[PDB]
Amino acid sequence: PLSCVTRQGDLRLGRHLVPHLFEDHAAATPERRALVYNDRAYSYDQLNRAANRIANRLMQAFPELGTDSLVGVRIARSDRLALTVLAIWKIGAAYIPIDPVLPAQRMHDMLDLAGAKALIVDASVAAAEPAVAGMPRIVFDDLVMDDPLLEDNPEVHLSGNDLSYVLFTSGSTGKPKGAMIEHIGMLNNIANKALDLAMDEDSRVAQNASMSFDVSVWQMFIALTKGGTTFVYDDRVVNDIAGLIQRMHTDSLTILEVVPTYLQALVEYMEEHPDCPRPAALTFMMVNGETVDAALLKRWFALCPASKVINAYGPTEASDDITHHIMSPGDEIVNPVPIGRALANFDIYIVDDELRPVPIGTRGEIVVTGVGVGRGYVGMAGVTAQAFVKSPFPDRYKGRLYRTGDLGAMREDGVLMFHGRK
């Protein structure tokens, strides 16, 4: 057999994109708790109304904003960030996360490469730093002000193929590359995760990742598509392991995603302080981003025996993950830990340099087609052409193929194994 797994078309995604699923819940159950950020709690209705005031004031200030318009957002992770992103999506536009800690020259490159039409900051950022001529800047605090006449849904038409966000790399070499992600790819990642994490209206999901990382998107919004609650854990909280663990206990958190080094810090703390309260409501811990090892996973399972663990793998360019490896405490967990099974609506291949699939068990490049393959890198046609190419394989979407630059191999059962960088 050849190293091919095909799941294009496997999962129906429903009629509604992410912002509209949130709107559905706000209409059906307005008083459910939607989002908590430290001392601030919003019901679905409060969050929706505030996002609508922002959206309507944005359309007043920028009447030409809409489909594929890119808006920079330089607001720290918070209720304010969630509200601003939701507002941008409601008016048909897409956003670029620009963490306030990033220096001005990085902001400039991100806005310039993206052709951004405007920048939204919060009051603290506006007071610390000047606007730049030619880049309209508007302030969250003004956009969100009370006005009961501005609280209805904008009801702008959104298509699945429209951009939802552009996420720039944050390495130490070259100009940053801004991956273009579309609403339908973002939705597909969320739909797969909601199923594999067994989510429901009682789910309580942590938003702990930096806004410079694409995983912060599904973390912020997945619960809002299900009637559950997002808990935003900012940098001050995440930097205090003891404090984050206590918060997860008090909040009865059910879903947490981390990288392996942070997982290690959590495991070490709980092993060193067995008297302390633990995240006993967690149903799933997801680890992603770098290679995880079996011994660390088994140490986690000893501490959180009621949880399952997902090893999640994929590139930002394909809307977050393309494989999930689901593990239960009783499983035979050994090194190397698999990266797992293709998400629905993708096809994954292990190929040689000419994109020819290799026999099962042979190492080659991981490449992917399907609904979540994004558009490329904004303002960079050459770099785009290096990794985004026309698929030579059957396709039911837009014919896109993404070369990950990762080496891997496929087992006979279709499970994928990660073998480093090509």
Ligand X SMILES: C[C@@H](N)[C@H](N)C(=O)NS(=O)(=O)OC[C@H]1O[C@@H](n2cnc3c(N)ncnc32)[C@H](O)[C@@H]1O
Residues that bind ligand X (CB under 6 A): 214-215, 288-291, 311-316, 320-321, 339, 404, 406, 418
Nearer to ligand X, 196 or 320 (CB): 320
Q: Which is nearer to ligand X, 315 or 379 (CB)?
A: 315
Residue 197 or 339: which CB sits closer to ligand X? Answer: 339
What is the Cα–Cα distance from 346 to 371, expressed in whole angstroms? 6
Q: Which is nearer to ligand X, 215 or 348 (CB)?
A: 215
Nearer to ligand X, 210 or 291 (CB): 291
394/228 Cα distance (integer angstroms): 38
CA distance 237 to 234: 5
For the bound state, the minimum distance from the C-beta of residue 299 to ligand X, rounded and expressed in Å, comes to 17
CB of 404 to ligand X, least distance (A): 5
Least CB distance from residue 321 to ligand X, whole Å? 5
Say how many C-beta atoms besides its own lie within 10 A of residue 329's C-beta.
16
CB 318 within 8 A of CB 397: no
Q: Cis before residue 130, ω within 30 degrees of 0?
A: no
Cβ 223 vs Cβ 203: under 8 Å: yes
Tell me if residue 139 falls in helix, strand or coil.
strand
For β-strands 94-97 and 70-74, DSSP reports them as parallel
Beta bridge partners of 256: 285
Residue number, 25 or 341, with CB nearest to ligand X: 341
162: left (phi over 0), alpha (psi -120 to 50) or beta: beta
Q: How far is the CB of 84 from ligand X (least distance, A)?
A: 22
DSSP state of 340: B
Give min distance, CB of 322 to ligand X, in A: 9
Minimum distance, C-beta of residue 312 to ligand X, in the bound complex (Å): 5
CA atoms within 13 A on the CB side of 61: 19
Residue 180 C-beta: closest distance to ligand X, Å: 13
User: Is 105 buried (19+), middle (13-18) or exposed (0-12) by CB count in 10 A?
Assistant: exposed
Q: Which is nearer to ligand X, 12 or 421 (CB)?
A: 421
